Amino acid sequence: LPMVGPLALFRFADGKDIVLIFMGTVMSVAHGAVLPLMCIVFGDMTDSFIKDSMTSHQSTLQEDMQSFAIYYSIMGFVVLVAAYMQVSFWALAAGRQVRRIRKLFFHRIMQQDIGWFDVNETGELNTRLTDDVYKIQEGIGDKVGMLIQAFSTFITSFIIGFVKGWKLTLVILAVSPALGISAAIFGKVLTNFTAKEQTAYAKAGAVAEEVLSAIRTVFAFSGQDREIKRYHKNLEDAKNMGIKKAISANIAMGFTFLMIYLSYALAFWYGSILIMSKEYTIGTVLTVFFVVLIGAFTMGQTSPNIQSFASARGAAHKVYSIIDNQPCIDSYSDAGFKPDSIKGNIEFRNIHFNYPSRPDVKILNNMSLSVKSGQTIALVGSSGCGKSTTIQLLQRFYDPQEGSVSIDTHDIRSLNVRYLREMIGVVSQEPILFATTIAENIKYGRPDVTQQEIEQAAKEANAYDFIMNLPDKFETLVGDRGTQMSGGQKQRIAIARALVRNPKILLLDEATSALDAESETIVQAALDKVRLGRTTIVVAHRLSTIRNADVIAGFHKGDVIELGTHSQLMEKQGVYYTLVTVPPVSFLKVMRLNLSEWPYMALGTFCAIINGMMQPLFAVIFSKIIAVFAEPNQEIVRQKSEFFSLMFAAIGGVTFVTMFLQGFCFGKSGELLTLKLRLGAFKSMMRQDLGWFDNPKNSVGALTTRLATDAAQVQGATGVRMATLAQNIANLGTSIIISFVYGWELTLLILSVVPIMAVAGSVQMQLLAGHAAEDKKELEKAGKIATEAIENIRTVASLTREPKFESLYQENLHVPYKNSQKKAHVYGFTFSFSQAMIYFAYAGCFRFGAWLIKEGRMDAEGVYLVISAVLFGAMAVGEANYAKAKMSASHLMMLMNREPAIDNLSEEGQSPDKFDGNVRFEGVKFNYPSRPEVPILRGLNLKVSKGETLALVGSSGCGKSTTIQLLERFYLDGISAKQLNIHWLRSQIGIVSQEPVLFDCTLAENIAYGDNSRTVTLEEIQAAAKAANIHSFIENLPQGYDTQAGDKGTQLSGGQKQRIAIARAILRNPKLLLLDEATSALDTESEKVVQEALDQASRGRTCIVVAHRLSTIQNADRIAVFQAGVVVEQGTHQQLLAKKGI
């Protein structure tokens, strides 16, 4: 997308904004510099500690630490002041820029031509306003400041690192390709296994969605278990691939960890080697290592601010392009002539018009008609071809592309737009009143009269009928929006607003339609009465306005043909001759699902606690490496440095193997849990009632996405949640115990400062709740008035009251500005304290450690071990979705055990071998949850016995919706409804689904599907297909019945689909067939073939015709009707055939 550079992004910065920007940039540079200086002083402090320890195998530690502590405090103060001031200046600049941007943007929008409004209109502009203003505010806000600080810190870190230790800096840098190639291998393996995992998961999700989409036919057939088998097998394969992906990702992360630790080890070994030669001192190596580390990590961390800068740049580009767009018609400029008086005439000389958007359409061609003032001229049209366009034009909404206007020897182009607009009075068909009092709404219009005639106008508009006895005499506090008016009321206030001193001319554009009869009469009377005294040309189609007239205007497609009497219009064949015209599940209940796989979770937790404890060991090894650089014997130094670098590598390897094992076990547990949850959820889906599913929240898409996503998400709350919490607990507990043992004093001091980091945020949240509230509310209401302005641009411009809307917008914007400044200041203080607290804690803790060292309670490395352990524990926890996983698990649990509302999978009940053929329904009062309000079902008492051919037609909304669904046992034959063997009833039926849905498998498999209790034999499949007449077309196929049919829905006709559906149905060879108007949506020949096949299959077999056309119903015995689930209009075929004459 287009993006502007820095020069344009800040174009709307004045001098006041520029000074703030300059100060912010300079202060941010200083802030960025401060951290590398911190590292330099840290290295010097380490050197001083080592010197004191070396002397004892002096008091200079006390004074040296005192000086370094004063240094640390001054760094703290400078960072506090600098960071607060940087954030404050940048936020203030953002606020001023955003305020001016909103002002100018709305000003320009209101300026744009209507020919430009119609091109993007309200949605684009409101989106732009909200989103893009957010983007621009976030761009030039604190984010650019953080970018500048990142640059400064990176450059300063590199320069100090080079200037101090060019050799060791070069070594650290040259170790970077190691991490680079580690990441390369990471990406390779990740991409390969990720693609494989997507393929595997999709292979099962496809079957999931195939079943869910066609659940009706999937379940109507006794094939609810073969689906379970298919899902089980596909999900087992997906489990294998998923565990492969998990182990791959874990090994990649472990290799990254191993390589970073190996980089540490090599760097420290080289530092030792140099120190032995006495080139770099321990302080120097520590300084250079930490400065390079901080530089790298800071560049990484401010990578995300780059994206914010870029998005802000793009949004700014579009906003600025809107700002600079100059409308062809200037609604604000005062350039033009203002004739002191105007006779009020109107003329047009072949004004050619085309909409700026899609100018190919040409409606106004050769429009030439004049109306001398003091006259009223009627208008007509069929599609509103010309009238709307010309009424828009007279308002200067669209520039006359070719023509001349000679209004009293004046051209509308050459006169002031505001004077022209106010010179005439026009109101839309339904002008949505602005969110104000009715008095203020009538005041809108001509402010020339403010109160005195504003109250008088009511008497003219026939609105007073309620105003005098309204809730208030003229409506203070009435508001509107919350209160509702009748259409006649809105129209009456509209005519009042029009008649508030409309100077000469008054027009109305289809201002009569969409009105009740009483309102129609009232408004017609009002229009008639207000016609007198001024030149009126109203666009309308009503008969009353049609008959009343003094002149006529005729252009049915934009063809001016008539300008005279009414009788002439009649003679002109006009319309005057066509007058006829969810309890959040707890942790324990979630773990009850992996209760089965606990063996894997146990080893996972054990290896996780080992992984966590490894971090404190890394802190302790850091303490020991720092301490062991103070040994006078050089050989001992080499031995210890070699051993500790080796132990660094060993901790890396332990972390690597432990991450690998963790990956293996937690992946396996998570995949087993996912398979179990998916299988249980699918089983619950199948068994549950049919009326459940059609619910909008139970949409096929909803269930599919739930199965795909929430299933995996649930892994986030059983093992990995336990693993992460165990790792964190082990890390902090071990760190705290080690620190306590080394010395409870410094342990307590660092622990006591730990609260100050976060607890200080309580005030931040207190002041930020107000921020969020004002943000949502003020955005909503300011944008609401913006949407009112833009969406009613027609009226807003025609009212000539754009400035008044601007003033309302600005007054609304006032409070957000103050709240934004408060937010800037409070965020600035919180950020400054968060930044300076680390420096202050360093200073205080190290001074205390010096004291304890002198007293004798803490060894030289005691302070380093305790501080490093606590700091690295904090970092580890900070590095280390749970609520989302809990929510998904709650939904899945309530799903898998919701209720057996209509137990369908219940294979209970007794099934006599013989089915007597009774379709009797006794005492069943039910109603569909889809249509419970509408009478669906009552004490149904329908009758059909064996050998019948009953037909039916539903007068109201496809009566099939009732009888087949009920009889199909979706919602009894002499036996109780639920006592019967539902499996037997579902098995012994010839129900044909409406739309034949075939399954993604062999045609042989689809044929065999009709039965799933017993396997299939090819001989019988052929028998059924030939009996189904489908063999005819199947005779030409790649392999025939067994064909995979790799087309997957191309080489199949509707008739072929119906034939295969019938073959599937009759595979059971049932003795009672049922239809659901399936034999439809096909060509006449296809339907004839379908009926021929069905009749052939009906040879010596009972059926119930439920077809939709007489062609099928020809071979029928009796026809029926059903209303509200009760027998009605039962009769013989000939009688009801006479009924449905059609």
Ligand SMILES: Clc1ccc(C(c2ccc(Cl)cc2)C(Cl)(Cl)Cl)cc1
């Ligand atoms: Cl497992 C782990 C621990 C610490 C780290 C980092 C780290 C890097 C350098 C140093 Cl000296 C300490 C910790 C962060 Cl958390 Cl600070 Cl980003 C990374 C991974």
